[PDB]
């Protein structure tokens, strides 16, 4: 039925008994580069089962006060097994994804989470200096980031944070959040479903790019209807994020990249 599914990729399987169908972004399933759209001339590496499998990133907790969370792809998976290895050993890389967000509660809980997949999800910074966010802050990895309820300008001139300041109702980029529904999405309304499943093809203005310099997709999760339970002002339910890269192919092998951190 629309509600029961099983996803198998490599050596990993995911089962769900409360789905609300699955979304295939823009109606496009991920695919490899065709010869007619090929650019780099060298033989690509395609790890296949070693990289195209389900990786579970860290679990976040939803509370009445949560504003939202965000992650960047392939960034969030840079340290994930052999996918991360191939990402850093190659100059160029390409991949699609199957994003599976998990969140179960009970029949006496309420709340709705909007799960959006955004191509080129550029976020707003914290200073008066334009495009000032530094690489280390823009790429948090598997832990991702969070949305805020208001904009707060960083004034420390001696030691600028050079970080993002994504305000939730402004979708972290100066647009109204209610219009974010034009992007592939699903809603995890506690009275209806457990999860949200989105299949994302590779989207870019090029056939292949640098995975370290460029993040193709952004995953934004916003509480559309806040978490509430029985009468417990105190309520916490975890949100686990499991993502699997698809049709990975890398070009331009050399020595490994070791990016600067923190």
């Amino acid at each position: 039925s629309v509600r029961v599914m099983q996803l198998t990729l490599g050596n990993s399987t995911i089962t769900t008994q409360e789905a609300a169908n699955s979304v295939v972004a823009y109606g496009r399933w991920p695919e490899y580069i065709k010869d007619s759209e090929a650019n780099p001339v060298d033989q690509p590496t395609e790890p296949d089962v070693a990289a195209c499998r389900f990786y579970t990133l860290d679990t976040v907790t939803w509370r009445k006060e949560s504003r939202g969370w965000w992650w960047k792809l392939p960034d969030a998976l840079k340290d994930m097994g052999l996918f991360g290895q191939n990402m850093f050993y190659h100059y160029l890389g390409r991949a699609g994804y199957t994003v599976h967000v998990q969140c179960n509660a009970s029949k006496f809980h309420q709340g709705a989470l909007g799960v959006f997949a955004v191509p080129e999800m550029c976020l707003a910074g914290d200073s008066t200096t334009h495009m000032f966010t530094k690489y280390e802050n823009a790429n948090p990895g598997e832990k991702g980031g969070e949305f805020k309820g208001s904009f707060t300008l960083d004034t420390n001139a001696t030691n600028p944070a050079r970080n993002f300041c994504p305000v939730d109702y402004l979708f972290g980029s100066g647009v109204l959040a209610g219009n974010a529904f034009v992007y592939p999405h699903q809603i995890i309304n506690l009275r209806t479903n457990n999860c949200a499943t989105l299949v994302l093809p590779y989207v870019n203005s090029l056939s292949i790019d640098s995975m370290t310099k460029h993040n193709n997709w952004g995953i934004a999760i916003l509480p559309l209807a806040p978490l509430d339970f029985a009468t417990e002002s105190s309520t916490e339910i975890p949100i686990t994020l499991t993502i699997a890269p698809m049709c990975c192919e890398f070009n331009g092998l050399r020595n490994i990249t070791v990016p600067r951190t923190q």
Binding site: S22, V24, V182, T192
Partner: protein
């Protein structure tokens, strides 16, 4: 090398020319080798919004229960 297309007549004159003949056609000829120099033809097509309106894996009927 002339391209002859027909116009979509809005307001009609009390003439039969307003309803037929070359009088409701327009002629075009490209003078430049580079396609960039060309004007816009404006005979543009449409498409199915489904990729945005219903990017669902398992196709559903509106009459039928969405959650099944």
């Amino acid at each position: 090398g002339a391209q002859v297309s027909s116009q979509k007549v809005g307001a009609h004159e009390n003439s039969n020319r307003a309803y037929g003949g070359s009088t409701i056609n327009y002629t075009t000829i490209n003078y430049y080798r580079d396609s960039a120099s060309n004007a816009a033809s404006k005979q543009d097509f449409a498409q199915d919004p489904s990729k945005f309106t219903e990017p669902i894996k398992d196709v559903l009927i509106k009459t039928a229960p969405t959650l099944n």
